[PDB]
Amino acid sequence: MQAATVVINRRALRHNLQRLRELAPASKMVAVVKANAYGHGLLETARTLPDADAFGVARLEEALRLRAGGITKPVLLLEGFFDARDLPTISAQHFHTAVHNEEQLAALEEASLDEPVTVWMKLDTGMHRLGVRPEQAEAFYHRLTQCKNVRQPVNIVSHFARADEPKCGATEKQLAIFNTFCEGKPGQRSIAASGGILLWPQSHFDWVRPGIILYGVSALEDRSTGADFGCQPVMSLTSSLIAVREHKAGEPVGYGGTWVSERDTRLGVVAMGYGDGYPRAAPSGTPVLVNGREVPIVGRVAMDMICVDLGPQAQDKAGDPVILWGEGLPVERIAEMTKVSAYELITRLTSRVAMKYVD
Amino acid sequence: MQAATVVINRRALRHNLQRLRELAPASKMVAVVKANAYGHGLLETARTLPDADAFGVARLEEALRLRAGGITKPVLLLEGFFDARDLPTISAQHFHTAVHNEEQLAALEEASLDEPVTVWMKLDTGMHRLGVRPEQAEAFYHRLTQCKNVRQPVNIVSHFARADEPKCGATEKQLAIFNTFCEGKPGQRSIAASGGILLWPQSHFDWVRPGIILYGVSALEDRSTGADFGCQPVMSLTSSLIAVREHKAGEPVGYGGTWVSERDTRLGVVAMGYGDGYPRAAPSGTPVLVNGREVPIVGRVAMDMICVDLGPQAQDKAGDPVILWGEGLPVERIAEMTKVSAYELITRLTSRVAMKYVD
Ligand SMILES: *Cc1c(COP(=O)(O)O)cnc(C)c1O
Ligand SMILES: *Cc1c(COP(=O)(O)O)cnc(C)c1O
């Protein structure tokens, strides 16, 4: 292929897992690979990290897509199970699960399984998304230690809502609540994801759950990159030019003739659009690398194409290599220029994009 | 349980192709199915419309994937071919192609094919994206009529840049240029897509290329839906609740504490996020149907989850049906609320979303 392609550096992936073990030296690793491993490929990303202590996924479907591919490490269902009739599979597949509601707990109480299941009680410490609230947590917790269907001890998990904002006291407050509930309880503790790992060493505890930073991308919006933490970028969104055309001063480009040129120039057309996952919101001027040289996007990003300004005697030609982000272009730069989160940029890509794996 | 799923109404798809034949009664139909048929499924959308005169795709890959699935109809390569070594496949697969540059034409000229290929010369009439400029078009055109590898006559294609803006004279100008070049030439003429079909009956000519409106969605941003033109919505983006929790006044929700409740209420958590293709940009208040009942999104949309405000004694519960857009909730309405183009909303979805076909 020469069009929409994501190149995944397996070497950078391994480097990052090891680099994260250096940053959180007393904690085991839950490699978070939900949403097709953040756009890098669920199964391939797991196979690249046979050293991971466990893998984290959002849904049950993802966890078995892993077992189907031969992945054997423990897989953590971060949101738990959505149907009580799933417990038998989860037990047999040796999936570890979070438990945040009455339905899940009552399911565990009355299920009949050939083996007990390892569980992580999800505690709501401030995010107010999933989890048992503090005032209901002690009773809920106690019922889990009385389950013979639950492998003792009951582990405790939680998640930060604003760890990337060190100067609001949100994280210290969640930590305060997390610590109060865990006092005197056995079982592993886990509350830190990318942000908690890098900015809060007092939240590492027993297990940390690296997601975005595992792929060498930064968790915060302070324009820092994965390299700020010694992590190497894994993904490169690439394509090729399918046309190099003459253009003249005063002439508009794209839908809504929205960019107008102030000079005679040459425009390049890239085989990349939002039908591939590239943000339609990308404003003119956003950087793209053409033949390893940065050129600006001019005009509205279409479903399948993107126009760039090369210059009046630019000698680029149809077929030449284009990098949407990658080596000369961290996805974090593209997120600042487009105002789109790096999390969304690397993850919201379509099945039209080819996948390559190197090293 | 059910999670992220796109339900495709085959009946509505059929209705729209006919309805468009009623709006452009003297023109053949090029069903545009590029980018996985605008998120509806490339092969299934083609199989639902065996009545289409032809199918349009962005890339050669998409056309070949149609032939692989048993689609037998003529397929139009809207951007042409990117490599000269592709001509033999194009010829053998009976793919019709656009020709916009020197490389493609020179390729046609010196290739040796067992059969000639049907071609549509792409003329740049104002969009300044792809196509031969007016002052180079006559010479370029004449070389195509002299090709042994091109099945005569040479057809002429072009595309509108601002057909959804009837008040600016952009479309009349492109039409003026298109008409001047086609004078005295045989061969089919085609310049109209969804907008040209609905708003410009002078631009129908021989072939019209319905894309977005084929799926019952409006090409415009004037709070018009597909129903404004008698076209029925084909896609519904659905999911289910995975939690219904108590929440209290003054408490924030989601990442960044973006939302704070002014009352004790109950929050619902949807198994839908941008890891599925739902816009991360969706602001609190964006409508979502829970049990058929519109509720607002509260807090930032995460990779796998979305929180909604149900009410203090709302009786919704984990497992209940949620509609992100669909029947009751046109994708247009969501586009208006989120400020994201309906084109991108239905198209930029990930492979995590299941596909269902009804009728
Ligand atoms: C997805 C998620 C993570 C990883 O988050 P990052 O910000 O990419 O580090 C960890 N834990 C939970 C509970 C999550 O849902
Ligand atoms: C995608 C495309 C279409 C369809 O346009 P809509 O506005 O979605 O109908 C038709 N023709 C060409 C050249 C295209 O690239």
UniProtKB/Swiss-Prot annotation, chains A, B:
The modification N6-carboxylysine is found at K122. It comes from the Bacteria. It is an enzyme of class 5 (isomerase). It catalyses: L-alanine = D-alanine. This is Alanine racemase, biosynthetic. Belongs to the alanine racemase family. It holds the Pfam family Ala_racemase_C. Pathway: Amino-acid biosynthesis; D-alanine biosynthesis; D-alanine from L-alanine: step 1/1; Cell wall biogenesis; peptidoglycan biosynthesis. The modification N6-(pyridoxal phosphate)lysine is found at K34. Changing D164A: Slightly reduces affinity for D-Ala and L-Ala. It comes from Escherichia coli (strain K12). Catalyzes the interconversion of L-alanine and D-alanine. Provides the D-alanine required for cell wall biosynthesis. Changing E221 to A/K/P: Slightly increases catalytic activity. Slightly increases affinity for D-Ala and L-Ala. One of its GO terms (cellular component) is cytosol. The active site is at K34, Y255. Homodimer. Its cofactor is pyridoxal 5'-phosphate. One of its GO terms (molecular function) is protein homodimerization activity. The lineage of its organism: Bacteria, Pseudomonadati, Pseudomonadota, Gammaproteobacteria, Enterobacterales. The keyword Nucleotide-binding does not apply. GO terms for biological process: cell wall organization; D-alanine biosynthetic process; peptidoglycan biosynthetic process; regulation of cell shape.
